[PDB]
Design a protein around this ligand. Structure first.
Ligand code: CLA
Ligand code: CLA
Ligand code: CLA
Ligand code: CLA
Ligand code: CLA
Ligand code: CLA
Ligand code: CLA
Ligand code: CLA
Ligand SMILES: CC1=C(C#C/C(C)=C/C=C/C(C)=C/C=C/C=C(C)/C=C/C=C(\C)C#CC2=C(C)C[C@@H](O)CC2(C)C)C(C)(C)C[C@H](O)C1
Ligand SMILES: CC1=C(C#C/C(C)=C/C=C/C(C)=C/C=C/C=C(C)/C=C/C=C(C)/C=C/C2=C(C)CCCC2(C)C)C(C)(C)C[C@H](O)C1
Lengths: 160, 90, 172
């Protein structure tokens, strides 16, 4: 029941709901990825990236990709595959608005079937709350990097 | 004065409703309004980007950017088709 | 609902009988074009692609007598440029253009509802005389052809990066 500014009157609730879940999932990946990037570094990346932190990695890999480097086309490849996925799953969000069977956010993606096994009356709320935190946490992480060069673990470890 | 021929597949296209019948879209009569609206926005951005990348035209241009710049006028016809289908319940 | 894509709706134009059906048409392209035209186009792309992937592998395996002396290094797409200087490509182009002329007549007959997509009646050996085994070879043709389109694109693009050619790029 949190909507004091009444922004659900200014757009379709279905479009807003799918947009919220997408923002929550993408931010989940961004926050978890930044913490993981500090804790573990995939092989070979230290010569292409050095010691750059979260946002710095985007600019530095795209800087290397801006030369003709073969070993720096990660950003284009992630952009390509996410764009391809958003292109082919694009009619789904219009089918939901048209009154379709599928609910916001459900792509029926349950390989392990953990949600299918037990009744899924809570995992939905688990995802929504964790993702809402993930968005705010990403916000935190990026702007704190924009002030101090520390990453997740470095900034949390001490107190400047 | 004599029967005027028209090609086979000529149908009645006169409309006095809010929107024309979906038959005015030809081969695009079965495409949904969401798909035209999203294709229209996509074509407008890609066409504008490709157009922008070749505004200083040179003797040797990128050929793909030229072909992609044709998406800007095509997007106008796409959003008109989106308005027609949304007002036809498609 | 659709089989391949569970969130999306079943494609209208597509039918279960149509060989190699997985209910896969997210963008609804089958609604735009005539379905028989798309079926013939897919079948043709399948057969060209099959030949090209097999040819890519064969070019790495061996070379017909005298070809080593026209072209020494070029393996995948480089050979085409040297051969257009000669009559080798022009000749394939002329004869395939001639074969495609009757392919065009076949397409016209198909689009009037008489002929079947990809059916040129070319079965000299006795491989389709059962109509249950025939259905399996039709589906196998489509699946191998789709795999071959992805493969041919994969091999030519790998040559564009490296210049190695398919099997030698596998070795190194
Ligand atoms: C918005 C998310 C996002 C973005 C833009 C990036 C972008 C980047 N990361 Mg980070 N990363 C992310 C998430 C993200 N990552 C996540 C989620 C993890 C795991 C916790 C990591 C772990 C990670 C490491 C360890 C490293 C990077 C590195 C990099 C750079 C090179 C690409 C690479 O190797 O990634 C590798 C990323 C992965 C292997 C994670 C892929 C996880 C996928 C998305 C999970 C999908 C699961 C599910 C089954 C799919 C559902 C599909 C459904 C939607 C249909 C690039 C700037 C490298 C770098 O240059 O750092 C200096 C590097 O060393 N990332
Ligand atoms: C899946 C993620 C992943 C994995 C397993 C590897 C694995 C490896 N990388 Mg790294 N790398 C990654 C992502 C990854 N990379 C990303 C996302 C980028 C930037 C786009 C790079 C850029 C990079 C460079 C620049 C180089 C490597 C190299 C290498 C290989 C040799 C190790 C080394 O030099 O130290 C090693 C197998 C090196 C290599 O291939 O040398 C033969 C090398 O020079 N990596
Ligand atoms: C906290 C994480 C979380 C949770 C609980 C959910 C929960 C849900 N998702 Mg979502 N999702 C998430 C993250 C998450 N998701 C992210 C980040 C992505 C992007 C790749 C997706 C993409 C996605 C799609 C495309 C779909 C779902 C769906 C679902 C639902 C059923 C699937 C299920 O039960 O899997 C439960 C999932 C988890 C428990 C997540 C596993 C997280 C593991 C334990 C660790 C993550 C490792 C990661 C690499 C980072 C490591 C940490 C780093 C700091 C070291 C359920 C409501 C489906 C749906 O809504 O309808 C069926 C659906 O179709 N999700
Ligand atoms: C799309 C198909 C395609 C194309 C454009 C080419 C083009 C070429 N190939 Mg490749 N090749 C192909 C298929 C193809 N080949 C196939 C299918 C094989 C066998 C698996 C090969 C094996 C091969 C080798 C080993 C070599 C070439 C070479 C060449 C070049 C010399 C021209 C020549 O003598 O080729 C002649 C090619 C053939 C005789 C093979 C054609 C076989 C198919 C099956 C024809 C069948 C017609 C069919 C039965 C009729 C059906 C009728 C029906 C419609 C009614 C030229 C670049 C040479 C080269 O420069 O490479 C370095 C070379 O050394 N090709
Ligand atoms: C388009 C394909 C193509 C091209 C450009 C060539 C080109 C050539 N062939 Mg080859 N050839 C081809 C396909 C091709 N061949 C095919 C499909 C066959 C049937 C298997 C032959 C069978 C053949 C024989 C038997 C001989 C040549 C020879 C020659 C060469 C004569 C001059 C020379 O090297 O000395 C010439 C370079 C002659 C040569 O010098 O080879 C040693 C020779 O004796 N050709
Ligand atoms: C049925 C009639 C026919 C005829 C008359 C020709 C005539 C010719 N072909 Mg073509 N060709 C045909 C069918 C035919 N072709 C078919 C059905 C195929 C398979 C698609 C090809 C594939 C083909 C290739 C790939 C090549 C020729 C070449 C040639 C030339 C032979 C080269 C030369 O100097 O002659 C002397 C001929 C000899 C055999 C002596 C050596 C000549 C213009 C070659 C060329 O370079 O053109 C100049 C060449 O490389 N032909
Ligand atoms: C894996 C390869 C493969 C397979 C299984 C088939 C299978 C088939 N083809 Mg296709 N075809 C292929 C490759 C293949 N084709 C290629 C590469 C070409 C280009 C040269 C053609 C050109 C072609 C034509 C022009 C025609 C067929 C036809 C047929 C059917 C009857 C003949 C038959 O049983 O062949 C079994 C074949 C194999 C076991 C492959 C070896 C059958 C569905 C006919 C058809 O559709 O009518 C029913 C027909 O007229 N094919
Ligand atoms: C039959 C399908 C097929 C197969 C088996 C391959 C197999 C391969 N491709 Mg190819 N590819 C294909 C289709 C295919 N491709 C298609 C349809 C395209 C689109 C044009 C490409 C475009 C492509 C490029 C542009 C490149 C490859 C590369 C590669 C190699 C390494 C890929 C890898 O493990 O990291 C993939 C990374 C992942 C995270 C995979 C998940 C491998 C030999 C690479 C290579 O070494 O070739 C020179 C490379 O640079 N592929
Ligand atoms: C969906 C699904 C699948 C899957 C999957 C996937 C990919 C699941 C991934 C789930 C993920 C990635 C969850 C990550 C959430 C991150 C959060 C909540 C962070 C908040 C940060 C905060 C609050 C902060 C902070 C602070 C710190 C420490 C650092 C400072 O500088 C900044 C600051 C002070 C602000 C599988 C395969 C399981 C199958 C299944 O059938 C379906
Ligand atoms: C230019 C030139 C020439 C040439 C030439 C030739 C032969 C050119 C051939 C070009 C071809 C066949 C390109 C095909 C590329 C395939 C693609 C992009 C598919 C990507 C799959 C995607 C995005 C998703 C796939 C999907 C995945 C992963 C998940 C779901 C499944 C699926 C939907 C499959 C010459 C010979 C004249 C010489 C001249 O000097 C240069």
């Amino acid at each position: 029941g949190f909507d004091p500014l009444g922004l659900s009157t200014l757009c379709n609730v279905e479009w807003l709901r799918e947009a919220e879940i997408k923002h929550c999932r993408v931010a989940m990946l961004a926050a978890a990825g930044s913490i993981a990037q500090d804790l573990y570094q995939f092989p070979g990346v230290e010569k292409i990236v050095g010691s750059a932190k979260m946002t710095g990695v985007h600019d530095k890999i795209l800087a290397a990709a801006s030369t003709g480097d073969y070993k720096a086309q990660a950003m284009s490849q992630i952009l390509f595959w996410t764009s391809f996925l958003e292109i082919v799953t694009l009619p789904a969000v219009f089918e939901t608005m048209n009154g379709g069977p599928r609910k916001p956010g459900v792509f029926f993606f349950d390989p392990l079937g953990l949600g299918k096994g037990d009744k899924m009356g809570e995992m939905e709320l688990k995802e929504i709350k964790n993702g809402r935190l993930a968005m705010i946490g990403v916000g935190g992480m990026v702007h704190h990097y924009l002030l101090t060069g520390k990453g997740p673990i470095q900034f949390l470890s001490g107190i400047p | 004065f004599s029967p005027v021929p028209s090609p086979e597949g000529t149908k009645e296209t006169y409309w006095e409703t809010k929107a024309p019948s979906s038959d005015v879209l030809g081969i695009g009569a079965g495409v949904s309004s969401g798909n035209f609206a999203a294709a229209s926005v996509f074509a407008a951005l890609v066409g504008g980007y490709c157009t922008g990348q070749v505004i200083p035209l040179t003797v040797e241009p990128n050929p793909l950017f030229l072909a992609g710049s044709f998406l800007l006028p095509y997007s106008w016809a796409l959003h008109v088709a989106a308005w027609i289908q949304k007002n036809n319940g498609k | 609902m659709s089989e391949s894509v569970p969130f999306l709706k079943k494609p209208e134009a597509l039918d279960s009988s149509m060989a190699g059906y997985a209910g896969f048409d997210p963008l609804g392209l089958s609604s735009i074009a005539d379905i028989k035209f798309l079926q013939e186009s897919e079948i043709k792309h399948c057969r060209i692609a099959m030949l090209a992937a097999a040819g890519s592998i064969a070019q790495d395996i061996f070379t017909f007598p005298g070809v080593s002396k026209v072209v020494g290094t070029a393996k995948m797409t480089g050979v085409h440029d040297v051969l257009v200087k000669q009559g080798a490509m022009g000749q394939i182009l002329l004869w395939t253009s001639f074969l495609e002329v009757f392919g065009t007549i076949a397409l016209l007959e198909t689009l009037d509802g008489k002929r079947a997509p990809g059916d040129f009646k070319f079965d000299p050996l006795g491989f389709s005389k059962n109509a249950e085994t025939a259905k399996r070879y039709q589906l196998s043709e489509i699946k191998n052809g789709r795999l071959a389109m992805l493969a041919t694109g994969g091999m030519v693009h790998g040559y564009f990066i490296t210049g190695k050619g398919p099997l030698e790029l596998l070795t190194n």
